[PDB]
Design a protein around this ligand. Structure first.
Ligand SMILES: Nc1nc2c(ncn2[C@@H]2O[C@H](COP(=O)(O)CP(=O)(O)OP(=O)(O)O)[C@@H](O)[C@H]2O)c(=O)[nH]1
Ligand SMILES: [Mg+2]
Ligand SMILES: [Mg+2]
Length: 370
């Protein structure tokens, strides 16, 4: 019988050592994020610079379009630029006044915010940094204008860098850097101006496509929920969540259960089942043992304003969810097979069936005390 605690927790050779980013990479992501923010604010200042000229005197739509064609907004399509000119020109004094006082704000969400960002494993997998852009508006400024300006910022940054690519997503604009295994998501929110924690009921997420242009979604709910869960459960929650995410990354090159569903399920389990934090191999064994049941009945979002769960119950499972249940069902067998191995190296080889050949030091495993 073996102990796998150091295998998990060692900050040099252990799984944690392989998953956590170095201060360098962390700073490279903060640098990329700062770049995106600076560009967004500059593009907004240029558009506001145009609109102030519109307010200061009647400017034909051609002139307004000539001014747009000289700003960073020139990195949009000709039709898109024309659209920006239209929306700026068709603004009534009121909306224009609310636009001239709009300075965008920024707040990061996701793994980079609550410290669960793993180093990617398989090719195609990249570091995900989600930096949300917030728009202090009353209650309103054009949804199309805002989306177009943030798109103009991102594309203006892509036009300055070899290897960068722009991708349009439903909830966000994205800048992809394949060569550096990195991508930055920029979701956009509308928030009450005067108020600007903050009343969730008014934090609206912008949608790119569909009949619905906005939907009430506050990321501070998930961030606070997970932080609270971390305080309540302990320091090991973040670790085992990192381990579960690494397992997901090792079993699927692309796809698998969402990180947030693994997080919610892991939290539920560590909230309802007794475990020992001084031994994360035992804890991981218990978690693996209880996860299939948690996913089978469905995983409800820690956000009650979500109509749909993070993972649906079994009677709705299709090929995808049945595949996820197959691997979730396969994990405990792997941890048990590794637990009862004949040698250190055999146990390593067996547990690396679950986390991949990332930990190579078999000396991190030890014989369990009596
Ligand atoms: N209320 C909800 N918010 C969500 C949901 N899915 C994602 N999000 C929000 O998007 C944020 C980031 O989403 P991601 O897909 O990148 C999950 P996360 O970054 O934590 O994991 P990794 O990026 O894979 O390391 C997350 O913190 C949430 O605030 C959801 O189903 N419900
Ligand atoms: Mg993220
Ligand atoms: Mg993302």
């Amino acid at each position: 019988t073996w102990n796998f605690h150091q295998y998990y927790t060692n900050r040099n050779d252990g799984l944690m050592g392989k998953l956590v980013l170095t201060d360098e990479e962390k700073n490279n992501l903060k640098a990329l994020r700062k770049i995106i923010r600076l560009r967004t604010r500059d593009v907004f200042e240029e558009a506001k610079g145009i609109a102030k000229a519109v307010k200061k005197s009647a400017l034909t739509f051609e002139i307004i379009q000539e001014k747009v064609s000289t700003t960073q907004i020139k990195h949009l399509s000709d039709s898109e630029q024309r659209e920006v000119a239209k929306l700026i020109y068709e603004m009534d004094d009121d909306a224009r006044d609310e636009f001239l006082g709009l300075t965008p704000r920024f707040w990061t969400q996701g793994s980079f915010q609550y410290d669960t960002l793993n180093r990617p494993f398989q090719p195609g997998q990249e570091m995900d940094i989600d930096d949300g852009t917030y728009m202090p508006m009353p209650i309103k400024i054009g949804h199309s204008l805002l989306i177009l300006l943030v798109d103009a910022s991102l594309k203006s940054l892509v036009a300055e860098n070899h290897g960068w690519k722009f991708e349009a997503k439903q909830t966000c604009g994205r800048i992809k850097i394949e060569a550096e295994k990195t991508h930055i998501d920029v979701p956009m929110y509308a928030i009450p101006k005067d108020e600007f924690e903050l009343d969730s009921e008014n934090v609206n997420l912008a949608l790119r496509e569909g009949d619905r242009k906005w939907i009430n979604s506050d990321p501070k709910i998930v961030e606070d929920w997970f932080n609270d869960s971390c305080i309540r459960i302990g320091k090991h929650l973040r670790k085992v969540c990192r381990f579960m995410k690494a397992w997901r990354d090792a079993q699927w090159d692309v796809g698998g259960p969402s990180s947030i569903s693994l997080m919610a399920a892991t939290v539920n389990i560590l909230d309802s089942v007794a475990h020992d934090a001084s031994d994360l191999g035992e804890t991981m064994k218990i978690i693996a043992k209880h996860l299939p049941s948690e996913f089978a009945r469905g995983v409800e979002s820690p956000d009650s304003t979500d109509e749909k769960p993070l993972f649906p119950p079994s009677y709705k499972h299709g090929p995808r969810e049945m595949d996820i249940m197959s691997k979730l069902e396969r994990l405990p067998e792997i941890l048990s097979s590794a637990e009862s191995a004949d040698s250190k190296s055999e146990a390593l080889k067996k547990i690396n069936m679950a986390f991949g050949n990332r930990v190579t030091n078999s000396e991190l495993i030890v014989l369990a005390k009596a």
